[PDB]
Design a protein around this motif. Structure first.
Motif, mmCIF file in Angstrom:
data_model
loop_
_atom_site.group_PDB
_atom_site.id
_atom_site.type_symbol
_atom_site.label_atom_id
_atom_site.label_comp_id
_atom_site.label_asym_id
_atom_site.label_seq_id
_atom_site.Cartn_x
_atom_site.Cartn_y
_atom_site.Cartn_z
ATOM 1 N N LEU A 186 11.511 3.200 7.158
ATOM 2 C CA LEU A 186 10.796 2.036 6.694
ATOM 3 C C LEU A 186 10.359 2.397 5.249
ATOM 4 O O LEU A 186 10.038 1.533 4.471
ATOM 5 C CB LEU A 186 9.409 1.927 7.326
ATOM 6 N N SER A 187 10.396 3.760 4.795
ATOM 7 C CA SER A 187 9.959 4.129 3.684
ATOM 8 C C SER A 187 10.110 3.371 2.509
ATOM 9 O O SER A 187 9.370 2.898 1.669
ATOM 10 C CB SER A 187 10.622 5.499 3.214
ATOM 11 N N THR A 188 11.302 2.362 2.420
ATOM 12 C CA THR A 188 11.423 1.685 1.223
ATOM 13 C C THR A 188 10.465 0.616 1.166
ATOM 14 O O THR A 188 9.747 0.346 0.273
ATOM 15 C CB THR A 188 12.958 0.862 1.569
ATOM 16 N N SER B 208 -5.058 3.081 9.477
ATOM 17 C CA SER B 208 -4.291 3.520 10.251
ATOM 18 C C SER B 208 -2.872 2.851 10.335
ATOM 19 O O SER B 208 -1.776 3.683 10.213
ATOM 20 C CB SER B 208 -4.802 2.968 11.668
ATOM 21 N N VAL B 209 -2.589 1.805 9.788
ATOM 22 C CA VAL B 209 -1.300 1.235 9.472
ATOM 23 C C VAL B 209 -0.681 1.986 8.709
ATOM 24 O O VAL B 209 0.651 2.305 8.452
ATOM 25 C CB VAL B 209 -1.682 -0.305 9.079
ATOM 26 N N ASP B 210 -1.436 2.209 7.353
ATOM 27 C CA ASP B 210 -0.761 2.987 6.343
ATOM 28 C C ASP B 210 -0.075 4.060 6.840
ATOM 29 O O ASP B 210 0.872 4.625 6.651
ATOM 30 C CB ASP B 210 -1.520 3.264 5.158
ATOM 31 N N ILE B 211 -0.800 4.944 7.957
ATOM 32 C CA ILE B 211 -0.456 6.093 8.233
ATOM 33 C C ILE B 211 0.859 6.007 9.135
ATOM 34 O O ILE B 211 1.876 6.464 9.173
ATOM 35 C CB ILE B 211 -1.365 6.760 9.323
ATOM 36 N N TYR B 212 0.728 4.921 9.820
ATOM 37 C CA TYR B 212 2.226 4.565 10.687
ATOM 38 C C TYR B 212 3.397 4.404 9.675
ATOM 39 O O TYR B 212 4.178 4.719 10.420
ATOM 40 C CB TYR B 212 1.873 3.518 11.653
ATOM 41 N N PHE B 213 3.163 3.784 8.482
ATOM 42 C CA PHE B 213 4.511 3.697 7.796
ATOM 43 C C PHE B 213 4.559 5.196 6.895
ATOM 44 O O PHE B 213 5.926 5.535 7.170
ATOM 45 C CB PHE B 213 4.229 2.583 6.487
ATOM 46 N N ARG B 214 3.773 5.539 6.210
ATOM 47 C CA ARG B 214 4.023 6.684 5.278
ATOM 48 C C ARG B 214 4.954 7.763 6.198
ATOM 49 O O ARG B 214 5.920 8.529 5.964
ATOM 50 C CB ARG B 214 3.060 7.316 4.638
ATOM 51 N N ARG B 215 4.799 7.923 7.540
ATOM 52 C CA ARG B 215 5.062 9.050 8.380
ATOM 53 C C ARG B 215 6.516 8.731 8.860
ATOM 54 O O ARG B 215 7.537 9.597 9.075
ATOM 55 C CB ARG B 215 4.333 9.169 9.519
ATOM 56 N N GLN B 216 6.805 7.296 9.001
ATOM 57 C CA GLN B 216 8.142 6.772 9.619
ATOM 58 C C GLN B 216 9.094 7.045 8.446
ATOM 59 O O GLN B 216 8.617 6.877 7.166
ATOM 60 C CB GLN B 216 8.184 5.215 10.121
ATOM 61 N N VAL B 217 10.388 7.485 8.555
ATOM 62 C CA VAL B 217 11.195 7.900 7.718
ATOM 63 C C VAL B 217 12.051 6.534 7.097
ATOM 64 O O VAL B 217 12.024 6.308 5.790
ATOM 65 C CB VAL B 217 12.319 8.604 8.051
ATOM 66 N N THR C 157 10.167 -13.021 12.079
ATOM 67 C CA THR C 157 10.148 -12.329 13.480
ATOM 68 C C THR C 157 9.207 -11.326 13.547
ATOM 69 O O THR C 157 8.502 -11.165 14.759
ATOM 70 C CB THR C 157 11.531 -11.909 13.664
ATOM 71 N N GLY C 158 9.340 -10.124 12.706
ATOM 72 C CA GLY C 158 8.347 -9.091 12.987
ATOM 73 C C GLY C 158 8.720 -7.994 12.175
ATOM 74 O O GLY C 158 9.074 -8.275 10.679
ATOM 75 N N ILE C 159 9.119 -6.598 12.510
ATOM 76 C CA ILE C 159 9.625 -5.606 11.680
ATOM 77 C C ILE C 159 11.210 -5.767 11.578
ATOM 78 O O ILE C 159 11.673 -4.674 10.908
ATOM 79 C CB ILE C 159 9.619 -4.267 12.496
ATOM 80 N N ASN C 160 11.709 -6.705 11.923
ATOM 81 C CA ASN C 160 13.080 -6.865 11.772
ATOM 82 C C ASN C 160 13.630 -7.947 11.217
ATOM 83 O O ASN C 160 15.068 -8.103 10.801
ATOM 84 C CB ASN C 160 13.776 -6.940 13.163
ATOM 85 N N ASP C 161 12.764 -9.114 10.975
ATOM 86 C CA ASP C 161 13.463 -10.114 9.965
ATOM 87 C C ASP C 161 13.481 -9.592 8.593
ATOM 88 O O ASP C 161 12.871 -9.248 7.688
ATOM 89 C CB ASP C 161 12.208 -11.285 9.709
ATOM 90 N N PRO C 162 15.119 -9.586 8.245
ATOM 91 C CA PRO C 162 15.549 -8.836 7.085
ATOM 92 C C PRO C 162 14.815 -9.548 5.819
ATOM 93 O O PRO C 162 15.207 -9.045 4.860
ATOM 94 C CB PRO C 162 17.092 -9.305 7.013
#
Ligand SMILES: *[C@@H]1O[C@H](CO)[C@@H](O[C@@H]2O[C@H](CO)[C@@H](O)[C@H](O)[C@H]2NC(C)=O)[C@H](O)[C@H]1NC(C)=O
Ligand SMILES: *[C@@H]1O[C@H](CO)[C@@H](O)[C@H](O)[C@H]1NC(C)=O
Lengths: 337, 42, 50, 375, 101, 49
Positions: free
Chosen positions: E63-65, E52-61, E29-34
């Motif tokens: 999604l860290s896992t 850029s994608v990597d930056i969008y991840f590392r800063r979010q808390v 589905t997206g960012i929510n498909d478990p």
């Protein structure tokens, strides 16, 4: 029963049967009572004796009929077109006959379409036999298309409505055509007023709440109110018994009906133990089958079956009309003899 | 992703194809008859 | 034209050679150029990562 | 440890502890053969659902804690007047608060207390996806229950018009007549004898039209009704004879359940004979049960409710299903176990109900317990 | 004759039934498909390193896992990732639409 | 007769007489009854979606 301020003083007391318990009119609340923080402040609840959640309730949609015998699949224009084209190809056949058996040819074509075994003519002129093949092909084509799109009609079902739950945006920015409802001074109302976000709908909810359940049920049966919100283990049975209503899917916050006793009576643990032992020995479920899951109206809104005499009209009337319209022409033709 | 339409009554809108097939058949057939005739007396 | 490194894995010594580029952007670049009167001499990047 | 609720995981090999959003699981393991002198500290870290509920409670009522796994067995079965596992550690060795995945029965409530439950659960069944369909009398199903006979009598009627009409106008018997008719309705696949009177010549073609409508209609309806079928699980409930008298059948079911659990010790007090029969399988672990259920070695499985519903929404494809509509057969709930009669009880209880007021349990649920199948 | 009609009709019906029921779910589905929050070690994501994608991840808390699960596989550039998901050596790829389309 | 058989035996025709051919055609008839059902099914399918 809920909590509220009174007499414009600093007194916050408890309306309703819970309040009655608080004051000393009885010492046990055996009824479909809910569980939540406020009430659990000062009353001891037994272990929960039936689990459920909140849900919604709406007036069942109305389906589409069996059919009008010949209406759905064809337009009248098509009938007229084929009707004329029959005689068209008939006269063309007769011309290819004479140029190098009319009452034959009319039979020939009308049969070729109607698949009836009757008929004895044939195309003598090779010119015509070149045509008859494709004529028959056309016949097969049309009848196949007919059956196909009748099948297409019988399987595509009704549109969306499916009010989803607390997230169908038809419930966050209410147009003034929808009207919710809950029972006043009821656990549900508490669950709303304390939540912060939902506040908006709360106000839209406020100006319509009812006095009790039966009023709400009877008021959504007759279309005077769109949606009703309440506790499942009532709504499920209610839909099962009278079957022009339906629930929609989701749950809200899973809670359990339980027995309730005044603050620290010496009876708690015995009651709790008895309830548990009851859940283990199936006795509870005997109650269940005896009072809840006993009756079943319809479900499975697919409903992909069950056609009956409603079709039979448009065709049986036709065959009877054929009967009655034969005799007149029979007399006419035996006179013409 | 709404499912799709549910058609009905199939007006002349589409059957034009089959009717054209029919008519073209008629035309070519009479053509071939006249051909066979003009050849046959020859 | 575009001067840039060969052997896109630049561990081995890069050879800054000329190639030519074409696509959806450099045309836009040209549009700008003829819009504001300036020259240019493009060249690819060394590391490859954005 | 328990698959969907309390996930264990070893530390990150760089720092020494593991990532955020978890709590260290200290003192896990002890010695085995030489001398205890308990090292304990093989510290790992755990996370999941129950852990989160614990963390939020910790913040909501001020206190601290430290979490250590268990050794002597499992959840815990009263044996010889003594308790293994978690209950054992919370009676004698003063663990003072058990958490994780406990059921709630009468026995355990006779020794320790219990908070308000927070997930419905109980006994449930699980079977391989009943590959196939149910359509025993599909052909008789569609298009009517009666109109057959109405057509029948309309036919017998038109036969009389045939004989009478064709008698008067310019080798025709009722037998041959009704024969031709009944042959026409289904398909003109029968060598017959036709009438000769022009009257009847028309009089039958209408009925032929009737036939070509009838047949197409019927086929269409059959196709429709066969499109939208419905599965029917090939077992009713825990009370079915198919569980009561297993030997009464072609090779009887082979269903198991991990022993020592609450579920078994429930079973053994209602159907003792069937419990005894079950002793021949007693699958171990859980994933073992799954594999054996995928390779024909079993055909039904009896275990807790919640953990099953999570396991259903997982397995690749969708080839494993819980019986019924998700029905449960011993309604109870998980909970929190605390040492007998500390005041703590009340102060915890309110706390948990607090979360039911702010949907937080819904967030947690949607974050751990959802699945992909069975939407 | 009735039996004959019955059988042939059933045949055509269930051939129709065969030709219209399509394939099962996969539909990540997206960012929510478990399937993307608790990665079994059969899935492997990928993005281009230092992007850029990597930056969008590392800063979010939150999604860290998945970030960590993402870390040990990222690629050098686009073409490598494309060619590596064509041949089944990598399940899913995350990137910017106006390239993927 | 053949071209009439493929679509539907809706045409007054003349059949052969040799037992050889008697069998030799019934196979083609089977062919027809497969063909027609297949075609109708496919049309229904393609018109559904
Ligand atoms: C259920 O509990 C029994 C308790 O005895 C377990 O049996 C023990 O397992 C240990 C090590 O596996 C053996 O040393 C004991 O001899 C076993 N006991 C007996 C009576 O044989 C049993 O393994 C437990 N079952 C599960 C699935 O955990
Ligand atoms: C069980 O009984 C007591 C515990 O009450 C214990 O001392 C004894 O050794 C045990 N014996 C067996 C056979 O389990």
């Amino acid at each position: 029963g809920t909590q509220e301020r009174v007499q414009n003083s600093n007194k916050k007391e408890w309306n309703g049967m819970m309040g009655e318990l608080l004051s000393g009119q009885a010492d046990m609340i055996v009824a479909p009572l809910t569980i939540n923080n406020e009430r659990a402040q000062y009353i001891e609840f037994s272990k929960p004796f039936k689990y459920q959640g909140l849900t919604i309730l709406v007036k069942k949609e109305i389906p589409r009929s069996t059919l009008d015998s010949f209406m759905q699949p064809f337009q009248s224009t098509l009938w007229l077109l084929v009707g004329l084209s029959v005689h068209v190809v008939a006269v063309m056949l007769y011309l290819l006959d004479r140029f190098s058996t009319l009452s034959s040819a009319m039979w020939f074509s009308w049969g070729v379409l109607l698949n009836s075994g009757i008929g004895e003519g044939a195309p003598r002129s090779f010119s015509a036999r070149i045509l008859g093949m494709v004529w028959a092909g056309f016949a097969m084509i049309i009848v196949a298309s007919y059956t196909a799109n009748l099948a297409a009609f019988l399987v595509l079902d009704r549109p969306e409505e499916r009010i989803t739950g607390i997230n169908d945006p038809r419930l966050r920015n209410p147009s003034d055509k929808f009207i919710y409802a809950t029972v006043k001074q009821s656990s549900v109302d508490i669950y709303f007023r304390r939540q912060v976000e939902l506040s908006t709908m709360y106000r839209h909810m406020e100006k319509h709440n009812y006095e009790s359940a039966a009023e709400a049920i009877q008021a959504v049966r007759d279309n005077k109110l769109h949606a009703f919100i309440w506790d499942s283990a009532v709504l499920e049975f209610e839909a099962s018994q009278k079957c022009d209503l339906v629930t929609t899917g989701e749950l809200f916050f899973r809670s359990g009906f339980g027995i309730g006793m005044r603050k620290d009576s010496p009876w708690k643990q015995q009651v709790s133990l008895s309830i548990l032992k009851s859940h283990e020995n199936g006795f509870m479920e005997d109650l269940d089958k005896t009072w809840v899951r006993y009756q079943e109206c319809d479900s499975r809104s697919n409903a992909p079956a069950t056609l009956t005499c409603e079709n039979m009209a448009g065709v049986f009337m036709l065959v009877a009309g054929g009967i009655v319209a034969g005799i007149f022409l029979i007399f006419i033709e035996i006179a013409y003899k | 992703e709404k499912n799709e339409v549910m058609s009905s009554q199939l007006d002349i809108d589409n059957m034009a194809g089959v009717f054209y097939m029919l008519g073209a058949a008629m035309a070519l057939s009479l053509i071939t008859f006249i051909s066979e005739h003009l050849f046959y007396w020859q | 034209i575009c001067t840039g490194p060969n052997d896109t894995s630049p561990g081995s010594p890069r050879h800054t050679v000329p190639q030519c580029c074409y696509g959806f952007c450099i045309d836009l670049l040209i549009k700008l150029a003829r819009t504001m009167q300036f020259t240019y001499e493009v060249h690819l990047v060394a590391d490859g990562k954005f | 440890e328990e698959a969907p609720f309390v996930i264990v995981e070893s530390v990150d090999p760089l720092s020494g502890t593991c990532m955020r959003n978890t709590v260290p699981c200290q003192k896990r393991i002890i010695s085995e053969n030489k001398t205890d002198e308990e090292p304990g500290y093989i510290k790992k870290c755990c996370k999941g659902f129950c852990i989160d509920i614990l963390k939020k409670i910790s913040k909501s009522v001020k206190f601290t804690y430290d979490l250590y796994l268990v050794t002597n067995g499992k959840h815990g079965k009263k044996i010889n007047g003594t308790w293994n596992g978690m209950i054992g550690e919370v009676v004698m060795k003063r663990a003072y608060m058990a958490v994780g995945s406990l059921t709630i029965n009468e026995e355990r409530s006779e020794v320790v207390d219990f908070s308000v439950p927070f997930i419905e659960t109980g006994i449930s069944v699980m079977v391989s996806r009943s590959n196939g369909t149910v359509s025993p009398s599909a052909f008789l199903e569609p298009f009517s229950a009666c109109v057959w006979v109405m057509m029948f009598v309309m036919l017998l009627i038109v036969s009389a018009v045939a004989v009478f009409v064709f008698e008067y106008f310019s080798s025709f018997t009722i037998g041959k007549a009704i024969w031709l008719l009944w042959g026409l309705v289904f398909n003109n696949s029968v060598p017959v004898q036709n009438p000769k009177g022009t009257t009847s010549k028309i009089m039958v073609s209408v009925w032929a039209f009737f036939a070509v409508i009838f047949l197409a209609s019927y086929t269409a309806n059959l196709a429709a009704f066969m499109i939208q079928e419905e599965y029917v699980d090939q077992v009713s409930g825990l009370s079915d004879k198919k569980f009561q008298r297993p030997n009464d059948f072609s090779p009887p079911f082979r269903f198991g359940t991990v022993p020592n659990g609450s579920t078994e010790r429930n079973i053994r007090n209602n159907y003792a004979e069937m419990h005894a029969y079950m002793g021949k399988f007693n699958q171990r672990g859980v994933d073992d049960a799954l594999l054996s259920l995928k390779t024909g070695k079993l055909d039904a499985f009896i275990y807790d409710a919640a953990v099953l519903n999570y396991m259903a929404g997982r397995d690749e494809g969708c080839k494993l299903v819980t019986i019924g509509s998700g029905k449960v057969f011993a309604s109870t709930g998980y909970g929190i176990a605390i040492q007998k009669d500390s005041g703590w009880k009340r102060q915890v209880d309110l706390a948990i109900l607090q979360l039911f007021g702010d949907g937080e349990m819904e967030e947690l649920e949607a974050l751990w317990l959802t699945g992909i199948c069975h939407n």
